[PDB]
């Protein structure tokens, strides 16, 4: 397997549990610090980063009824410049650029308690697919499915339904939607960290997935595995392999990686392309910092970059 060593440039530092890098509709850059704590209690933050100075601005420090959040993953909406944030303690949140937020669901469509979420990914239809490796959201005691298979997957539909689409995962983490060349969603890829596996489903429609299949294998025997992920414009899936010092590059069909990217750190946690560029911003937990490097090509256009009222 060929391996490349591009130059990684420091972007910002000192972000506890650096994670969920994302760009909004204005091109502003954000990341989350899920592990910031106050008196040992969860006090996660959502930060805006000045790409030119690297200076940090905490725009939101979520909390519901006294319970602080553990914001871990993000996706920028299209129909409004707002961020959907997966939170390990509060579930799904919608965060405005002004820092105000709202908790989306305390229970799912079947009336069962919502679970803590980790990452999410919009399909071009506007449906948000979410991973939920944690147990019930606050005020329930904090737990994670690293050892027991109770992690779940959700789909938040355009009509506002929070539907659990599957469960029994051992820490579902990164997630991504593979689209047909004409833009139709048809494959959901889910990372299950400890098992060193990438799972896929055939997307049949909103909150409808079938045929769970082992899609790809993550290299290494180290503690950790697939964390965050994203597709480039050719539909190659780049996955942060936490603990391996590499970002794995899978081809459209999966299987084994067809290439690897060596990082100047051991724990890449998540990544995200800057719109209209080949630049990938990476969050990592060895130094709790954010970096950037140039990929061989541009990233797959995110849902927020598409036009709802376009002709084509
Ligand atoms: Ca993650
Ligand atoms: Ca990303």
UniProtKB/Swiss-Prot annotation:
Changing residue 302 to W: 3% decrease in activity. The lineage of its organism: Eukaryota, Metazoa, Spiralia, Lophotrochozoa, Mollusca. Changing residue 119 to F: 100% decrease in activity. Ca(2+) 1 binds at residues 19, 118, 173, 227. Changing residue 242 to F: 44% decrease in activity. It is an enzyme of class 3 (hydrolase). Gene3D superfamilies: TolB, C-terminal domain (2.120.10.30). Optimum pH is 8.0. Changing residue 302 to F: 50% decrease in activity. Changing residue 171 to Y: 53% decrease in activity. Changing residue 193 to A: 60% decrease in activity. Changing residue 285 to Q: 54% decrease in activity. Changing residue 171 to V: 46% decrease in activity. The keyword Magnesium does not apply. Pfam families: SGL. PANTHER family: LACTONASE DRP35 (PTHR47572:SF4), LIPOPROTEIN-RELATED (PTHR47572). This is Diisopropyl-fluorophosphatase. The active site is at 285 (proton acceptor). Changing residue 75 to W: No effect on activity. Changing residue 285 to W: 44% decrease in activity. Changing residue 235 to S: 4% decrease in activity. Changing residue 171 to W: 19% decrease in activity. GO terms for molecular function: calcium ion binding; diisopropyl-fluorophosphatase activity. It catalyses: diisopropyl fluorophosphate + H2O = diisopropyl phosphate + fluoride + 2 H(+). Changing residue 270 to F: 100% decrease in activity.
């Amino acid at each position: 397997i060929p391996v490349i060593e591009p130059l990684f440039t420091k972007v910002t530092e000192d972000i506890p549990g650096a994670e969920g890098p994302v760009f909004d509709k204005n091109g502003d850059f954000y990341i989350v610090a899920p592990e910031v704590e106050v008196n040992g209690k969860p006090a996660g933050e959502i930060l805006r980063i000045d790409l030119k100075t690297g200076k940090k601005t905490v725009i939101c420090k979520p909390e519901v009824n006294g319970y602080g959040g553990i914001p871990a993953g993000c996706q920028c909406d299209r129909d409004a410049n707002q961020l959907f944030v997966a939170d390990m303690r509060l579930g799904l949140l919608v965060v405005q650029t002004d820092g105000t937020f709202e908790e989306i669901a305390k229970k799912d469509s079947e009336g069962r308690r919502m679970q803590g979420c980790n990452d999410c990914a919009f399909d071009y239809e506007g449906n948000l697919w979410i991973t939920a490796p944690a147990g019930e959201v606050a005020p329930a005691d904090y737990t994670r499915s690293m050892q027991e298979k109770f992690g779940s997957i959700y789909c938040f539909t355009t009509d506002g339904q929070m539907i659990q689409v599957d469960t029994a995962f051992q820490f579902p983490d990164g997630i991504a939607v593979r689209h047909m060349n004409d833009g139709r969603p048809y494959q959901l890829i889910v990372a299950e960290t400890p098992t060193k596996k990438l799972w896929s489903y055939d997307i049949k429609g909103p909150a409808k997935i079938e045929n769970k299949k082992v899609w790809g294998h993550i290299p290494g025997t180290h503690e950790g595995g697939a964390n965050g992920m994203d597709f480039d414009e050719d539909n190659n899936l780049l996955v942060a392999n936490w603990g391996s010092s590499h970002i794995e590059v899978f081809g459209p069909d999966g299987g084994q990686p067809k290439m690897r990217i060596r990082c100047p750190f051991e724990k890449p946690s998540n990544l995200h392309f800057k719109p209209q560029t080949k630049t990938i911003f990476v969050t990592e937990h060895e130094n709790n910092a954010v970096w950037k490097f140039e990929w061989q090509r541009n990233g797959k256009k995110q849902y927020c970059e598409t036009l709802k009222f376009g002709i084509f």
